[PDB]
Amino acid sequence: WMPAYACQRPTPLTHHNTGLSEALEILAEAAGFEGSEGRLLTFCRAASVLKALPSPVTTLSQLQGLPHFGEHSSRVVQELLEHGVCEEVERVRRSERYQTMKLFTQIFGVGVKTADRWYREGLRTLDDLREQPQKLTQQQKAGLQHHQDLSTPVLRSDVDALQQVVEEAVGQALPGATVTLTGGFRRGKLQGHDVDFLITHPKEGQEAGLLPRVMCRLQDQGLILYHQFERSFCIFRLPQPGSWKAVRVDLVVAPVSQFPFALLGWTGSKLFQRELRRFSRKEKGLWLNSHGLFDPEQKTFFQAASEEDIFRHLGLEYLPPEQRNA
DNA sequence: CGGCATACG
DNA sequence: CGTA
DNA sequence: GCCG
Ligand SMILES: Nc1nc2c([nH]c(=O)n2[C@@H]2O[C@H](COP(=O)(O)OP(=O)(O)OP(=O)(O)O)[C@@H](O)[C@H]2O)c(=O)[nH]1
Ligand SMILES: [Ca+2]
Ligand SMILES: [Ca+2]
Ligand SMILES: [Ca+2]
Ligand code: NA
Numbered sequence: 001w002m003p004a005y006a007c008q009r010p011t012p013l014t015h016h017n018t019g020l021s022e023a024l025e026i027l028a029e030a031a032g033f034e035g036s037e038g039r040l041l042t043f044c045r046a047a048s049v050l051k052a053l054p055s056p057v058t059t060l061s062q063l064q065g066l067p068h069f070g071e072h073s074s075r076v077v078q079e080l081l082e083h084g085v086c087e088e089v090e091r092v093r094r095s096e097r098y099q100t101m102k103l104f105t106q107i108f109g110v111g112v113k114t115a116d117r118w119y120r121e122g123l124r125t126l127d128d129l130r131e132q133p134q135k136l137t138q139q140q141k142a143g144l145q146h147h148q149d150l151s152t153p154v155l156r157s158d159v160d161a162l163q164q165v166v167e168e169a170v171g172q173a174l175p176g177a178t179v180t181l182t183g184g185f186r187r188g189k190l191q192g193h194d195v196d197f198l199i200t201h202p203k204e205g206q207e208a209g210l211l212p213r214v215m216c217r218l219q220d221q222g223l224i225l226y227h228q229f230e231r232s233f234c235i236f237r238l239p240q241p242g243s244w245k246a247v248r249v250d251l252v253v254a255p256v257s258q259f260p261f262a263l264l265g266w267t268g269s270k271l272f273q274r275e276l277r278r279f280s281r282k283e284k285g286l287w288l289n290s291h292g293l294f295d296p297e298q299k300t301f302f303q304a305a306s307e308e309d310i311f312r313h314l315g316l317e318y319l320p321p322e323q324r325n326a
Numbered sequence: 327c328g329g330c331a332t333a334c335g
Numbered sequence: 336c337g338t339a
Numbered sequence: 340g341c342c343g
Contacts, residue, residue, distance in 0.1 A: 137337080233338050
């Protein structure tokens with residue numbers, strides 16, 4: 001019926017079980033806030049299964065045979081089908097622990113571990129953090145200062161103007177270098193919390209040393225509100241009607257030999273990529289990352305000229321980015 | 327039961 | 336530890 | 340939490 005790995009099935013951005021998937025993803029998120037990566041994965045995968053279905057789930061019977069639905073996830077769906085609400089999910093939603101971990105981890109520079117420590121220390125609100133700035137890293141100070149802007153979704157309409165600014169700086173840094181939009185926008189999203197760009201050059205090796213040159217030029221243009229190599233996680237100044245707003249932008253450089261692997265990895269979704277790497281390793285005996293695909297028996301790397309090549313070498317039907325919304 | 331993606335900053 |  |  002439906003295969004067990006999310007990389008084996010198309011997953012569109014919009015689907016027929018939105019409410020059920022959102023409920024499961026609350027439990028997934030809450031598991032992650034408690035450090036239970038296994039439970040987070042199962043709830044994420046069960047949610048993703050529903051996203052891949054061709055029609056709404058109406059009755060519990062329709063979960064029989066679907067992968068990743070056991071007693072717990074099935075009970076969640078059952079309660080939503082019978083009452084429109086799942087008591088467990090609602091308890092999580094209104095819990096002080098969930099709400100505060102959510103608010104803290106949403107800060108750029110704050111992960112689960114930091115948020116958990118703050119929570120145990122008694123901290124609960126953004127103003128609690130602002131009042132004791134001595135415990136904050138420079139990254140976290142920037143994420144806290146910019147938090148309101150960064151909490152607002154970026155529009156696909158904003159992205160093109162920003163891509164052109166990046167292209168101009170990239171072209172000065174290295175003529176002929178290219179900029180490719182990746183992340184959720186490449187999967188078709190009309191909004192997102194940040195913009196992702198992948199940079200390369202058609203002559204292998206010319207990209208060496210490129211990212212610092214790009215960042216220096218963007219900084220000289222006054223566009224960088226914050227930046228800390230081949231990956232840069234920045235906060236950019238983006239024009240707005242009569243003003244501007246802070247936006248998170250990630251820049252990545254890859255040599256053209258690795259570009260298909262980097263494009264695949266940075267286009268996501270996060271669950272899709274984890275499932276693809278898991279499939280590669282556990283079903284095909286091959287090790288996948290954003291740089292390449294390694295056969296550990298022959299000790300050789302697969303040359304890829306396209307994403308299509310990578311799917312073929314893993315024995316998977318090709319999925320365009322818009323069907324990778326696992 | 328073991329496993330749960332895999333890097334870089 | 337943070338980030339993707 | 341679930342799969343194999
Ligand atoms: N956020 C995130 N992305 C990750 C991780 N690991 C990983 O490979 N990625 C890759 O990085 C890509 C871009 O990260 P992102 O957070 O901007 O993802 P996105 O564009 O779908 O999210 P957004 O729509 O909220 O902007 C993901 O789609 C995914 O392929 C991870 O742990 N977290
Ligand atoms: Ca089952
Ligand atoms: Ca993004
Ligand atoms: Ca990103
Ligand atoms: Na964070």
